[PDB]
Amino acid sequence: DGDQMISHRELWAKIANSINDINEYLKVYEHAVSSYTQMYQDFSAVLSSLAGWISPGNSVKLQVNSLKKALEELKEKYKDKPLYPANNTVSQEQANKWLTELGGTIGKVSQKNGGYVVSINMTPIDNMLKSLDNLGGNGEVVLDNAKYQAWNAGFSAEDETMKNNLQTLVQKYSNANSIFDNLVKVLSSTIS
Amino acid sequence: DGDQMISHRELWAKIANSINDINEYLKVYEHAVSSYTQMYQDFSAVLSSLAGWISPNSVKLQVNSLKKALEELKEKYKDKPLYPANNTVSQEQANKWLTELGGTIGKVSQKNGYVVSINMTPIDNMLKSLDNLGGNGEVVLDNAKYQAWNAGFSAEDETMKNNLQTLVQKYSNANSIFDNLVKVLSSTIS
């Protein structure tokens, strides 16, 4: 039973196969971080442009159509850029396994071509688009210093929501790298 | 070289030997985390007692009360080190583990025999920052002086907090390497 023999040559093949299996596991994390960094980058640009989209109206006059147009273009930009698998698609239970691995809030499962993918969770974008529409009025809307301060607080709260979501995603990727590094060091130091 | 054959029993043995070797890594990490955690818990207790040492518009500070508390914490952990938990090791044994854990978390001391004691440079900086304050116990400081001192005091606190956090992460990462290696050994059998 345990008398079956294998060569050193066959072991290195089994090691190299498992090495490639973990590398593609890391490249999923690598792409997931890269696409969420870009999404947060473009979002932070919308928040930096906010200063040029507000003006005095004691109160302030907010250009809603300019801000809503930028968020719509941002949501449309990452409609076809998912966190995983960046190409083709996988099954539904497979996408749910990666959603739970990456975090439920940072990702969102959706199907594209029969199968399913893990698209970027655009809930803070949707929440920012609905909060604007509830400031009833075509074009620009005037709000007192108190209401704008509360609306701007929720805007910065969603911005910090993405900032910490990205930081934990980077930490998981950094941890997986160190776990892979020492794992390869261990497997090589054994047959050395 | 590559034509050499090994049996399935030698496979299970070769994996188990590396698993017992990495378990010795976890034995060091587990204790070192436990020793630095108890120190930061005792230090966190001193922070909870800081509210009773400041009082009112300037502030008053029982400098000698906080000084003796910090100095007692260091003397408590002067003999309780990070590694080894018992006895001692060689010089290059403590230096290799100092580099593994980080040159900032620990300090290599000599016992007849070397040991990696807990690095107390944050406590030393706090004590000199307190000694730079006024004399004879209680000290009066305006709001500006308390803002600056508490800023550097919170910085040294956050330094130990980050030191403990990164050490736990290495221990969590080192445990998952043990877990994954166990998964391969269990799969090879059957």
Author numbering:
A (entry chain C): 124 to 180, 185 to 319
B (entry chain A): 124 to 179, 185 to 240, 242 to 319
Original authors' sentences:
Like many Gram-negative pathogens, Shigella rely on their type three secretion system (T3SS) to inject effector proteins into eukaryotic host cells, driving both cellular invasion and evasion of host immune responses. Studies in Shigella have demonstrated that bile salts found in the small intestine (e.g., deoxycholate (DOC)) interact directly with the injectisome tip complex protein invasion plasmid antigen D (IpaD) to support interaction with the hydrophobic translocator protein IpaB and its stable recruitment to the maturing tip complex. In Shigella, IpaD resides at the extracellular tip of the injectisome where it functions as a “gatekeeper” that prevents unwanted protein secretion (leakage) through the injectisome prior to requisite activation events. Here, we uncover critical mechanistic details of the Shigella-specific DOC signaling process by describing the role of a π-helix secondary structure element within the T3SS tip protein invasion plasmid antigen D (IpaD).
The IpaDΔ1–121, ΔQ148 structure clearly shows that the π-helix has been eliminated through conversion of the surrounding region to an α-helix. When the proximal (bottom) regions of the structures are aligned, a modest translation of the distal portion of the structure is observed in the mutant relative to that of the WT. Importantly, however, elimination of the π-helix does not impact the registry of the surrounding residues or significantly alter the positioning of the adjacent side chains, supporting the feasibility of this mutant as a means to independently dissect the role of the π-helix in IpaD. Fortunately, a 3.00 Å structure of IpaDΔQ148 verified the removal of the π-helix (conversion to α-helix) and minimal impact on the global structure of the mutant, consistent with the CD data for both constructs. Aligning the IpaDΔ1–121, WT and IpaDΔ1–121, ΔQ148 structures additionally shows that Y149 sterically prevents the F308 rotamer change in the WT π-helix structure. However, removing the π-helix moves the tyrosine side chain approximately 2.4 Å away from the helix interface and the phenylalanine is no longer prevented from adopting the necessary rotamer conformation that supports DOC binding in this region.
